[PDB]
RNA sequence: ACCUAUACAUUACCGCUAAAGUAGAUGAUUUAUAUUACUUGUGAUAUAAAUUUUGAAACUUUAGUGAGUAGGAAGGUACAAUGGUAUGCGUAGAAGUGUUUGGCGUAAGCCUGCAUGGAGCUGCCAUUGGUACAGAUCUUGGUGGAUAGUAGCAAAUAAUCG
RNA sequence: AAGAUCAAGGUUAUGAUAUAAAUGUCCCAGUGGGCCACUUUUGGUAAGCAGAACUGGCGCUGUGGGAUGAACCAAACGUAA
RNA sequence: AAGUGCUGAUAGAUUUAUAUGAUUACAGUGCGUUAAUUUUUCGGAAUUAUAUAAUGGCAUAAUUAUCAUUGAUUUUUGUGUUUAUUAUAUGCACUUGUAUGAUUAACAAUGCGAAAGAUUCAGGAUACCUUCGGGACCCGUCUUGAAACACGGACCAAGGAGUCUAACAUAUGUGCAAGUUAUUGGGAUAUAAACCUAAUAGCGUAAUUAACUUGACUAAUAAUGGGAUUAGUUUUUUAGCUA
RNA sequence: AGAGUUAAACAGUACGUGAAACUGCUUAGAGGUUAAGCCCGAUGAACCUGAAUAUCCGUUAUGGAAAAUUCAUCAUUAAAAUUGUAAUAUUUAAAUAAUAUUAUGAGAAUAGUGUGCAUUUUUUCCAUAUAAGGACAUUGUAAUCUAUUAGCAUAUACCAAA
């Protein structure tokens, strides 16, 4: 009369990546070896950043490589992004850096190698710090996505700044009634 | 593509009421087709969700023709991404036989915005229609917007 | 005879009889094959003692004495010579079983070839036969 | 004192959840010994013997729990087609089908034997659906009990010898 | 008064616990007809009646028990000794 | 309250212990320290005779808490005396010794694999028959509740019902990514495919006001700034541990 | 009904194949306890399935019989590969690394010869042996283990009252 083994025991979080790819889980099973067997974090937390779904993966920009530099204690590093790194045009000067990344952009591979930086694979990264010397963990910012401005979608409770689901943006396109005081209420 | 098969109607055979409960079955429009009534019964519904629901925001603006104000729009922010890559390093250089001259009019933006913050490198900005702002930053940068055709 | 597979803990086959689904024994339209009573009157589904046995994994046989012949070999659908050999190495804990859409001529080779290879065939009288 | 629920205790076993390791094999590990180094006793090396080729998108290993409509998700099973494949099967008998053949799986269902058969057919990995039936006062065809005979085949007499 | 900078502090300042918890998305089904009992109660003489409050069941629940039984009692059911 | 000593019965006994994982620990017995007493009186066995540590019991002293002081009890510490008890100083060889965390086997009997052929034994709710007990009311369904004196369904076979499409949201995978989508069309063909792809256009790259309009400032940079909670890393400094 | 024909009339004009419902017959068995149908447990009948080997304290010791020749203890000869290393080219200029080509050294084996190619060895067979011819199956006893039930026999402590 189990008082109480109700819920939750499914939990949350995956065992393995999503994915089919033969590579992405080859990275897995190296850091998964590298996990117990060398202790520290480094090799703890990479093996989950790989099950990481492409949302919670958003790609990481080369301006926000060379911001990381600016970083004090930080200027011998190789900055680690598990994550597809983007071709950042603005920043004018790129600095030299080796970056490790799952996927480089071909315009942000020419801009690394151009500084003269290498591109690099986890894997040869693995090799080089096992124990992730000096390394640098970068996430991306998911707050950019256009669903989680959706995500608060509600009128009342003195809210939202949360984006309607309009196809189309224009006067007669949810200006009216409920967005405004004229047309009864404030939002 | 499809597969049925990964259709779970498919598992649901039988399953009596295939996910269409038995008390109150899925039974063809329930609550009214479409958007019916909006004033009424999902009068909720739609303020929530959709909240400038119904009325007007009027200026009824007959004929317009989006050509007269079709207005493409290039920002301060990014400018400097109408100057090819390799020579976007080259007139860094510090040579000046200058200040750079970029047409923006060709680049088919046809408004120069405002947005902000440039380097200090001088840069003269041919445009159609201006931004106050971003010649203002562009003055302090030391160029000019020359306008243009 | 033919030497049995590895060691087993005896097959408990653990209910033995077909489930037949509800009422098969009242209708002949209702077929012995198992089909679980959804339905909002069931005394079957609310397993009142005498409503014989609803197929529910208790009745699960363990996980060593899964697949096991009681002579221990498993069953692998041999077409043909080829497909006889993969049994070779594992002899014990297989048995080719002739696909009934072989020809006798055939057969012969099968069972001929299965002696040689010494691994148990389940059928031979399959297909034979006084005749051409 | 005794009796006794799927409760309760223990144990084997199923599943689901949990929790941990497993991924130097030109290498590792165990065992015995000869030699050598140090030391009492240990390691190195040589030799001989033995184990180890892991769906490492699983196994080994572990523990706690399981009613269940509506419903949700997960994983299979069957059916027709398709790309590929098994140098697949096949008139020396295919498919189909009857079947107290034998067996497998909790099941969905599978194979096989035997009989019938006569011309074509299937497994596996992916790929698509007009994809699985007991019902719908379902449809269409067939068939029972009622009933080899019960209603009846009785109004206008109704023949009959032959 | 807030933001707040700086320095001081033995033991973190009830008790059991955490099946890990919090958080987001789906805007997801299913539901919008409840029924019964302890207790508390209103209408009604009352009802297997109409209607609340709290809580548990039944709805979705057999098994053992009340001879019997949707609901009461005991108890929540993988398969067996 | 004492494993002081002890008997019966019941059910279970995964044992793939190298699939890719352990067999380790203890004990007995022998070995080579001696003596003395006792029992059997043969083989042996016990107890006593050391050092070390702990513990209880005696006496004495201090603290600290407490019941009240006649006297006790507590937690802590020290000291002296004697005695008992227990652990350490008990290694190596061998061992069918104990356990090694699901430790069923010593030991034995019987059937029997007896070539093909095929005896004999054990075991079985296959189909189905039999014999015994117990349980089993008709499914589907709406309904609070169905075995209902609720409704459909005599019986059986086969058709037979959550789809396709346009457009959409969310989850996810895939491609590329500050861009993407060629397939309107053209080039081409092993042909309604594949391969190639001019040019636009769509969406995204600025929004908001009705619209006119104007323009996110700061900085090459600041992932919005500052601030507070947050990971991961580098990093000052120190400690412990291991190598 | 015989017969002919046909590979088959188990293809003889509902004619390929051949279902279910349903019915007749035959074969088995029973029949008053719910009308009948049913599940489980025990149980009989028909019917079927499963069925193994070497050891006390070990299966090694020993003896005989046959056969082998790169290896057999190893040497030589030839054949090609592997381990490690280097070069020259390519890959990535260059490095490490990898790859193609080439070369060297360490070795091991496939064939040939050789003490022997049964001087002997080794390989392969057979017999005999210690409790015993055994462990598939079912059985006996006893020792244990886990859960448990039910006694036995031994001895105290304290409190009240006495």
Redesign the pocket.
């Known amino acids: 009369?189990?008082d109480?083994?109700?819920?939750?025991?499914?939990?949350?979080?995956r065992?393995?990546?999503?994915?089919?790819?033969?590579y992405?889980?080859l990275l897995?099973?190296?850091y998964?070896?590298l996990?117990?067997?060398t202790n520290?974090?480094?090799?703890?937390?990479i093996l989950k950043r790989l099950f990481?779904?492409?949302?919670?993966?958003?790609?990481?920009?080369?301006?926000?490589?060379?911001?990381?530099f600016?970083?004090?204690?930080?200027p011998?590093?190789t900055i680690?992004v598990v994550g597809?790194?983007?071709?950042?045009?603005?920043?004018?000067?790129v600095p030299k850096l080796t970056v490790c990344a799952l996927?480089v952009?071909?315009?942000?591979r020419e801009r690394i190698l151009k500084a003269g930086g290498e591109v690099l694979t986890f894997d040869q990264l693995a090799l080089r710090?096992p124990?992730?010397?000096?390394?640098?963990?970068?996430?991306?910012?998911r707050?950019?996505?256009?669903?989680?401005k959706?995500?608060?979608?509600?009128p009342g409770v003195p809210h939202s700044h949360t984006?309607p689901?309009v196809?189309?943006?224009?006067?007669k396109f949810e200006?009216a009634r409920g967005?405004?005081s004229?047309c009864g209420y404030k939002k | 593509?499809?597969?049925?098969?990964?259709?779970?109607?498919?598992?649901?055979?039988?399953?009596?009421?295939?996910?269409?409960?038995?008390?109150?079955?899925?039974?063809?429009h329930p609550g009214g087709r479409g958007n019916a009534g909006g004033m009424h019964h999902h009068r909720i519904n739609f303020d929530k969700?959709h909240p400038g629901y119904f009325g007007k925001?009027?200026?009824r603006?007959f004929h317009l023709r989006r050509q007269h104000?079709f207005?493409?729009?290039?920002?301060?922010?990014?400018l400097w991404?109408l100057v090819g890559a390799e020579k976007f390093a080259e007139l860094e250089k510090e040579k000046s036989t200058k200040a750079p001259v970029i047409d923006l009019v060709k680049f088919?933006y046809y408004?120069l915005?405002?947005?902000?913050?440039?380097?200090?490198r001088p840069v003269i900005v041919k445009a159609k229609?201006?931004?106050?702002?971003?010649?203002?930053?562009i003055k302090?940068?030391g160029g000019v917007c020359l306008l243009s055709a | 005879?033919?030497?049995?597979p590895?060691?087993?803990?005896?097959?408990?086959?653990?209910?033995?009889?077909?489930?037949?689904?509800?009422?098969?024994?009242?209708?002949?339209?209702?077929?012995?094959?198992?089909?679980?009573?959804?339905?909002?009157?069931?005394?079957?589904?609310?397993?009142?003692?005498?409503?014989?046995?609803?197929?529910?994994?208790?009745?699960?046989?363990?996980?060593?004495?899964?697949?096991?012949?009681?002579?221990?070999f498993?069953?692998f659908?041999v077409?043909?010579?080829?497909?006889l050999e993969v049994l070779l190495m594992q002899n014990r804990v297989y048995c080719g079983?002739?696909?009934?859409?072989?020809?006798?001529?055939?057969?012969?080779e099968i069972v001929e070839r299965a002696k040689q290879l010494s691994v148990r065939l389940?059928?031979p009288?399959?297909?034979?036969?006084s005749?051409?």
């Open positions: 009369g189990i109480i083994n109700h819920k939750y025991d499914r939990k949350v979080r065992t393995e990546p999503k994915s089919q790819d033969v992405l889980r897995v099973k190296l998964r070896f996990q117990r067997r520290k974090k480094f090799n703890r937390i990481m779904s492409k949302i919670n993966r958003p790609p990481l920009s080369l301006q926000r490589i060379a911001r990381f600016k970083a004090a204690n930080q011998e590093s680690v597809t790194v983007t071709d950042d045009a603005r920043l004018l000067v996927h952009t071909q315009t942000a710090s124990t992730g010397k000096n390394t640098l963990l970068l996430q991306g910012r707050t950019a996505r256009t669903a989680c959706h995500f608060g979608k509600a984006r689901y196809r189309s943006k224009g006067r200006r967005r405004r004229s | 593509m499809s597969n049925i098969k990964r259709k779970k109607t498919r598992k649901l055979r039988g399953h009596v009421s295939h996910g269409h409960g038995r008390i109150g079955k899925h039974r063809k969700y925001v009027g200026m603006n104000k207005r493409p729009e290039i920002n301060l922010d990014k991404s088919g408004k915005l405002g947005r902000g913050h440039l380097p200090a229609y201006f931004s106050k702002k971003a010649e203002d930053k302090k940068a | 005879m033919t030497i049995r590895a060691y087993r803990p005896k097959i408990v086959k653990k209910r033995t009889k077909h489930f037949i689904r509800h009422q098969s024994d009242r209708y002949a339209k209702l077929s012995h094959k198992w089909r679980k009573p959804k339905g909002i009157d069931n005394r079957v589904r609310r397993r009142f003692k005498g409503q014989y046995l609803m197929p529910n994994i208790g009745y699960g046989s363990n996980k060593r004495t899964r697949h096991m012949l009681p002579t221990g498993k069953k659908l077409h043909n010579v080829r497909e079983e002739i696909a009934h859409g072989v020809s006798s001529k055939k057969r012969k389940t059928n009288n399959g297909r034979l036969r005749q051409e």
